[PDB]
């Protein structure tokens, strides 16, 4: 509905801009 758990992560192809879910 609003929030959802994600096993994967995020990676912004930039100057070291990565995320972790």
Swiss-Prot record:
Entry annotated with the keyword Disulfide bond: yes
Record keywords, A-Z: Antibiotic, Antimicrobial, Disulfide bond, Fungicide, Immunity, Innate immunity, Secreted
UniProt-listed GO biological process terms: defense response to bacterium; defense response to fungus; innate immune response; killing of cells of another organism
A GO CC annotation given for this chain: extracellular region
Predominant location: secreted
Keyword Disulfide bond found: yes
Cystine crosslinks: 11-18
Compartment annotation: Secreted
Biological role: Insect defense peptide with a broad spectrum of activity against Gram-positive and Gram-negative bacteria and fungi. No activity against S.aureus. Stops respiration in bacteria but does not permeabilize their inner membranes.
Domain remarks in the Swiss-Prot or TrEMBL record: Four regions are important for the activity: the C-terminal loop, the last three C-terminal residues, the stretch of seven N-terminal residues and residues 8-9 are necessary for the antifungal activity and dispensable for antibacterial activity.
Protein name in the entry: Thanatin
Source organism phylogeny: Eukaryota, Metazoa, Ecdysozoa, Arthropoda, Hexapoda
